[PDB]
Design a protein around this nucleic acid. Structure first.
Ligand SMILES: [Zn+2]
Ligand SMILES: [Zn+2]
Lengths: 129, 125
DNA sequence: TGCAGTCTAGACTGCA
DNA sequence: TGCAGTCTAGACTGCA
């Protein structure tokens, strides 16, 4: 288990839930990137931890980072879309860009283009094609 | 025009003292040249300077100065005047080992908006 | 802090 | 034009 302690511990806990969609190092970076950002919103950090560790056993609040102008998030030099990146890490290893729709109760879903963007993977659904 | 800048880049490559890798050098030179395609006077100044290994003293060759004065090239952080001095004169140059000419208007240590990179406006110490 | 190195949004580039 | 990648000034981090 892990609450709001050292990022390293947290990063590790979360790493153990990855699906191996990408390399050890990418996931580590992506997750460290996200934990750091979330240390400013420890309510949302906790929400992320509980969602991931319970595999969505319960409903979770949104987990948000700031929208970039073009929507993209860069992680270790690679360019992607944030919601997709983290959904690939924690639910669907072979996910594709336009492959997911959001949950009717996600207030900060990516497609909504709010100042914020939800990255909580249990707030999206895989819709192929 | 375009082919012009490339012609200049590769020429300046011939005078590189192998201080850094080939690619790094090209990247650093490509960057400098692009910044100068407007001040085509300072450009020619730079050109004649390097090719003659310091025969005819020329105009300051300046660029816009950053916030911390550093200039990144192919990932590496460094100081402008140094980077380019190390590239054409002293391959093992060190940060502190560089004093500027007393007629150089836009010398680095002068904290002006522009920074002269013409290496022959600096001398090693 | 100051210094030296890492990361990434925004700016930019090239290919289709 | 749109997309997917490259680059780096500025933000940050760690060490002393
Ligand atoms: Zn949400
Ligand atoms: Zn000068």
């Amino acid at each position: 288990p892990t609450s709001n302690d050292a990022c390293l511990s947290i990063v590790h806990s979360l790493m153990c839930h990855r699906q191996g969609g990408e390399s050890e190092t990418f996931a580590k970076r992506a997750i460290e990137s996200l934990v750091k950002k979330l240390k400013e919103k420890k309510d949302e950090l906790d929400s992320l931890i509980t969602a991931i560790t319970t595999n969505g056993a319960h409903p979770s609040k949104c987990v948000t980072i700031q929208r970039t102008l073009d929507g993209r998030l860069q992680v270790a030099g690679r360019k992607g879309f944030p919601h997709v990146i983290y959904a690939r890490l924690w639910r669907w290893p072979d996910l594709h860009k336009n492959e997911l729709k959001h949950v009717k109760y996600c207030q900060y879903a990516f497609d909504l283009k709010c100042d914020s963007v939800c990255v909580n993977p249990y707030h999206y659904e895989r819709v192929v094609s």
